[PDB]
Amino acid sequence: GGGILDSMVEKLGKLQYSLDYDFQNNQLLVGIIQAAELPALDMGGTSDPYVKVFLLPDKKKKFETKVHRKTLNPVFNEQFTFKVPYSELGGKTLVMAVYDFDRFSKHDIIGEFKVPMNTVDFGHVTEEWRDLQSA
């Protein structure tokens, strides 16, 4: 019994994001909207979340949202732009990872998820809530 429970996805919160490829300017648009039900990693029963967003395997443009202090349900409302030609997009993977900011210690990663660009239906704004995966 316990072995199956151990294989289940742990409740590490969820992140809502939006995605759209701008064929007019030839850039991938990423909207980091909000996160919910994040686990508390600090003593004050909270975390200081922020999101790192980038594209594998390149990741030349390492983006980070502002840090939202003392909250397990932050609303980021941030947008990022990756100037990548559509033809180059197929082989890439968009990575989104939520970290707990700490001024004096290594920032702990809370969770992440990946979006293979070849699974994305473009020419339509994609928007979804994704459960964070253990990293």
Give the chain's domains with CATH numbers: 1-135 (2.60.40.150)
Structural determination approach: X-ray
Instruction: Measure the CA–CA gap between 126 and 35, rounded to whole angstroms.
Output: 17
Q: Could you give the count of Cα atoms lying within 13 Å of 45 in the half-sphere of its Cβ?
A: 0
Tokens of 70: 């003392």
Residue 118, classified by CB atoms within 10 Å of its CB into exposed (0-12), middle (13-18) or buried (19+), is exposed
Instruction: Measure the CA–CA gap between 61 and 127, rounded to whole angstroms.
Output: 22
Q: Which of 98, 130, 110, 111 is nearest to 19 (CA)?
A: 130
Task: Point out the annotated binding site.
Answer: 41-42, 48, 100-102, 105-106, 108
For β-strands 27-36 and 75-82, DSSP reports them as: antiparallel
Q: What phi, psi does 7 have (nearest 5°)?
A: -85, -15
Beta bridge partners of 94: 55, 115
Task: Point out the annotated binding site for Ca(2+).
Answer: 41-42, 48, 100-102, 105-106, 108
Instruction: Measure the CA–CA gap between 67 and 108, rounded to whole angstroms.
Output: 13
**Cis before 57 (ω within 30):** yes
Residue pair 49/68 in contact by the 8 Å Cβ criterion: yes
